Amino acid sequence: GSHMKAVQYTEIGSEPVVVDIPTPTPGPGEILLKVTAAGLCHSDIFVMDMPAAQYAYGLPLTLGHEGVGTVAELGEGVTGFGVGDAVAVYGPWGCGACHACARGRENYCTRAADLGITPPGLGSPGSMAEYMIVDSARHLVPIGDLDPVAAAPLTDAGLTPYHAISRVLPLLGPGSTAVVIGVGGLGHVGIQILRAVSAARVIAVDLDDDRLALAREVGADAAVKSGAGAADAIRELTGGQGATAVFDFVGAQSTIDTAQQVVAVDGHISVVGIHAGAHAKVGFFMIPFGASVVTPYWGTRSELMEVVALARAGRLDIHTETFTLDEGPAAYRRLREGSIRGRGVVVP
Amino acid sequence: RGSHMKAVQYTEIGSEPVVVDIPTPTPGPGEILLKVTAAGLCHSDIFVMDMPAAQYAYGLPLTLGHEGVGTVAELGEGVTGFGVGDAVAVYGPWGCGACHACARGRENYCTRAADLGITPPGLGSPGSMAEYMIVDSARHLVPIGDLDPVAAAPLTDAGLTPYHAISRVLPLLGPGSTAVVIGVGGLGHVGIQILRAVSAARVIAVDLDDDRLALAREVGADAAVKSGAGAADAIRELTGGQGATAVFDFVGAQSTIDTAQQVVAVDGHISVVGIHAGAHAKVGFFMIPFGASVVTPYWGTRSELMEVVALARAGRLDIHTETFTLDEGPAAYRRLREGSIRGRGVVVP
Amino acid sequence: RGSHMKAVQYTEIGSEPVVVDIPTPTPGPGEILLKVTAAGLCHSDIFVMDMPAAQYAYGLPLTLGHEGVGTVAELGEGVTGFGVGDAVAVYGPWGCGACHACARGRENYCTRAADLGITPPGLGSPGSMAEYMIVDSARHLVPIGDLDPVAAAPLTDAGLTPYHAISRVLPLLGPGSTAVVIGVGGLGHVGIQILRAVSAARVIAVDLDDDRLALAREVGADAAVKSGAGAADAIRELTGGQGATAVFDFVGAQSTIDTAQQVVAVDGHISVVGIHAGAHAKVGFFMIPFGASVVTPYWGTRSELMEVVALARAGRLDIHTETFTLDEGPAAYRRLREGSIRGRGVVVP
Amino acid sequence: GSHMKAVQYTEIGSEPVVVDIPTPTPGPGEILLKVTAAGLCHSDIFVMDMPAAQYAYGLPLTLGHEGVGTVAELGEGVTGFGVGDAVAVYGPWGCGACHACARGRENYCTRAADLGITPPGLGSPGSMAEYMIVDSARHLVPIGDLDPVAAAPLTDAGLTPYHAISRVLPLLGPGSTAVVIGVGGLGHVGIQILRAVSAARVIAVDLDDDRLALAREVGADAAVKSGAGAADAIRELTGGQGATAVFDFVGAQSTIDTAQQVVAVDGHISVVGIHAGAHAKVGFFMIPFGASVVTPYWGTRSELMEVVALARAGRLDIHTETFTLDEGPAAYRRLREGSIRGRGVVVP
């Protein structure tokens, strides 16, 4: 087909729409995928909530930064993959040539911004379409016979918490404690990751009673209600020592404040969730000595392969609700209203 | 038949239509009285009732309904051609019948109707939204046979108007041509079906709403893109940069007209069918491609209305309908104003 | 045909239904897969979805739609009696098929369904509001021939339920008898048409709206009176104090039941068809005439559904319908909640 | 067992023989029964005395339309019974989808003939074999711990008179009179049914004093010898008012004439027995006003359940003579010469 359906953001402040666009063809080094699953998440809502005042360029944009597909056509010179191979799309594309990229950490590429290299669905054409172009073979990760619908959330919902945890994994030995604030999406996956790759005690923190109960099912050793009393309740559980690491998947100022009140000396706070303007306050006597704080970004290539390995070993379970490509906009409406249980996945 | 009838009338400016109790008309010589079987309502009725009172000169009261269908009730003196009970659709844009335009069949472009005060039913003359109505002459009736009156009523406007616009330039729409339809509401929805039935042109739809884009594909649009600033680029993306032989703008907003001028092909056509007061195409050198003609078409001809009925009876035209009673008349208009009707509302006595 | 299909499901207690993408079912041995052509909605769907969470056991997720019509898409192993393409309506109140009541055709009164967990489609089993549905057995399909599926769907409930209630005492409704119909909404006005088609009983209608009384007269009611404290006297005025042979209360409120007991004749009948939680007739000496039986009937039998279909195909039954798409499902149920639908809403995949 | 013994009618004009045939296997929706009792009735002889032109049940034919057994194997998708359940077979199979079938009256199915649906032992394989197939679960009726030998006659010898009586049961109130002509196979059960489901007086009519004596034991209030004097005798026993209902299980022209001579105004005559060419003459002044006549056929499924309920309550006592499967053909010779006391039953 000379044209294909794509879920696109086409004007500021509007809803995504299913529109017909030319079917792309892979240039030298590129790979054309037939999309099999395209995950959606609140990051898409955040991008689509950006005001017009800040807008400079990017429209129209094919959505979808959580992409899985089968190789449909290989660009000239591409080897290492064959037509039909099931692959997940590595999201945070880098230049491949800087020191950070050479070390595998393309998500921290120091040249991507200058070169205008943007992730699919966030500046480059995304995966919510019948077909999609991938710029380079090194951004394809094989998934074998893993269900594409289960693999799609792993590209973001699994990779991002896995990276945040991986940054300080050597600290999470037996006797350590990891606090997870927000146990619904990324945090639910984070708890499973923590139980698979460490022996740390896991304390779940959330506003909803039901989410906390589900957090215990996937390995959380204790549960705490988010809010003003959370810090004291957490210290009650850890004794007077505090938490080795706090992974804040909410990112609100109140949750960041709680993290600073419970993190242990020489600990770590990871601000994964995004709330505009919210920030940790790292200064003497405002945070324990040696407690580092960071805003991590997505994850590395090898980390995505490790997430796929966890999923294929049965250590990662992410509940998904499926939609057709025609229902792309409907799925985003459901996402806004909070009626999606699990992670939405578009299946073209 | 009784001596009084229910009717829905615009009775005073700025007010909503109301059900009333008026006498049953009687057919004079050459006239025909019909038992209305379906009376379609349309946003054009809304446009008329939105007329500011400062513009008002005369007209009220006015039985609404310019999309009329019914069965012959009583033949006026000397009226041959139809027998009582014959199912007929009412041709809307009444003309004088004697000028050059009328003699060619194009009564919608009659050059004397304005001077003579000849007005269409429901838009100056007693409309179809009543138990009976008067049709001035036999030539303003089109037989429909066993066609469902509810299916026929919307096609007197939602079918005839796009059909005429398309017919004006149909010879240009051969195989290999591309026709763009902006606005996939009632008019554009049927316009796409017409294009597929009477031509081999590729149809590309444009609309604001995702569900209307999906509707366009269902009824034969090969492709559909969202209206707005990027609409012209998205169309030329699908055509390989060539541009459309014809653009039928059933919205008529200035932004949609702008899009049409940016995608129409050299020696093409733009048809401004939808009305937005003040919106206009700007036909000038280097502001529109060479040879691309622009027009604002008006309703359609009688022979075209017959062709629309033949298309409908062959199963080539479909429009979603919502049936109401006369007492629900005003309620249907409020539903129309709030934009909750998909397709066309139709009042069934 | 597609490995996945669209459906409208009730997924959370207190939450509106949503469109979902779920696997296309495959018919097992003895089952039949239908391509749905129409799926009706009615107030009973709201009653179910309004149930509090405290009383929730295991029903979710539930594909809604207990008024199903479609065409046979695939026959399960060993199924005979229908061919691919046959138009059929779905019999709602599924039973075990093996008890005495089932062997008599009265599956709606099966004495084993509750113990065995046999639930109707859309009320425990996957309903008809989807592109495809499974029917457990060929004995729950009723051929409809060329009957319009949109007209057939509401009659699986709105026709069958009054038809059964009337059929329970049809021998009493001979010439000279009087049948009172309370509530001329969906079920009641179909009930009026049934009474006129299958009996010579004089029909008196009772309703609140003045508009409903006129409609009752149009569809066959010989007389109509206003519901309220004066309805009992008004009815007895028309019957001369003899009382009404049968009273079919399609409202089911306590006040309407009280009026029923006040007008029902000696040796007559009251049928409490409408549901109002807690409302009940009081059957005791000198609180109701001697010999006047009272019952709360439930849906109808399979042979009765066959007879309802035969009445519809003979043009004796008519219910106003309003069609929606599967994507419009949730919006249609909202329309029903606010009481904006006249007649019955029908979802057409 | 790959094969099984069966009593089959293999050629026109010959006696049934015990032959070996493949053991059937149940298809989807079917049930395989291990037969525990198979009854013989004169209808089998009538079928076997048909000339070549009239016979339309195909050859070979496994005989036996009075079948009872235990569920041996369930066809695909058959729920409702378990292996080992004792069940009686409903004989007059119908389409299950016509108006008559939907009302439970499968015996009066209007499409069975056009569709080739025939009863077991009368077009379909019968019960006089080690195993038999039943087309559908709805044609099985549980019997509990009822003795299969006593249960087999209930499927025809009980069901058929029960249906004939049920057609006009509302007429047989206290003060009514029911005349039973032929108190052998079916009339013996008819007398017991009448006493169980009605208060009508029962007058027995038969040729043999032996048969009349038994009729009086099972509830017949009076006995009359069949012949030209029966009509006068019956009216003498009822003054001159007549019999509300006459159930003629002989079906001969002479007995039908006796029925028409004794039936009451607005009464009923049921011609249950079959004698080719015999017929009632329903015309003005040839029969009392309002006296309806009918030839009933077998019975409905709900009536079979009611017959089973009567037997399990001790209300039906069927006189049986048991035979082995190898004795099958011999039993039919016994039935031919009228040397069987009551009902013959083969027990495989």
Ligand SMILES: CC(C)(C)[Si](C)(C)OCCC[n+]1cccc(C(N)=O)c1
């Ligand atoms: C939140 C960002 C500003 C980085 Si955004 C809208 C460009 O995320 C898209 C990349 C997916 N994802 C989702 C949530 C969190 C993160 C993370 N903490 O890296 C990444």
Ligand SMILES: CC(C)(C)[Si](C)(C)OCCC[n+]1cccc(C(N)=O)c1
């Ligand atoms: C208010 C309108 C300007 C649309 Si009026 C009063 C000309 O519509 C009545 C005739 C029906 N119809 C509807 C839409 C468009 C046209 C057309 N392009 O002719 C005609």
Ligand SMILES: CC(C)(C)[Si](C)(C)OCCC[n+]1cccc(C(N)=O)c1
């Ligand atoms: C079992 C349910 C709780 C869903 Si009920 C009783 C609201 O109806 C479902 C069956 C449809 N219908 C609608 C109205 C009345 C009746 C009736 N009188 O049988 C039946």
Ligand SMILES: CC(C)(C)[Si](C)(C)OCCC[n+]1cccc(C(N)=O)c1
């Ligand atoms: C009905 C048939 C003509 C095929 Si006959 C009599 C050979 O047997 C089949 C059913 C067996 N049975 C025996 C006795 C009486 C009756 C009855 N009155 O129905 C039925």
Ligand code: NA
């Ligand atoms: Na536009």
Ligand code: NA
């Ligand atoms: Na009342």
Ligand SMILES: [Zn+2]
């Ligand atoms: Zn994401």
Ligand SMILES: [Zn+2]
């Ligand atoms: Zn780099």
Ligand SMILES: [Zn+2]
């Ligand atoms: Zn119009």
Ligand SMILES: [Zn+2]
């Ligand atoms: Zn003119």
Ligand SMILES: [Zn+2]
């Ligand atoms: Zn219903």
Ligand SMILES: [Zn+2]
């Ligand atoms: Zn049952």
Ligand SMILES: [Zn+2]
């Ligand atoms: Zn027999």
Ligand SMILES: [Zn+2]
């Ligand atoms: Zn049948």
